[PDB]
Amino acid sequence: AMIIVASYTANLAAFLVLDRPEERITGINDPRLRNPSDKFIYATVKQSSV
């Protein structure tokens, strides 16, 4: 029973804070930007300095 409640508390806190999957782009040097897919509208506004 002490093994059970200890393992349950470790599964609780582990599932609480383990990780988060992240697909955040880096910036100008990211290959999904520079070689874009068909799904990638990386457009902007017109008549800008960009």
Residues forming the site for other proteins (CB under 8 A): 23, 29-32, 34-35
Distance separating alpha carbons of residues 44 and 31, to the nearest angstrom: 19
Minimum CB separation of residue 34 from other proteins in Å reads 7
Nearest to other proteins of 23, 38 (CB atom):
23
Minimum CB separation of residue 8 from other proteins in Å reads 32
CA angle centred on 24, ends 13 and 48, rounded to 5°: 150
Binding residues for glycine: 49
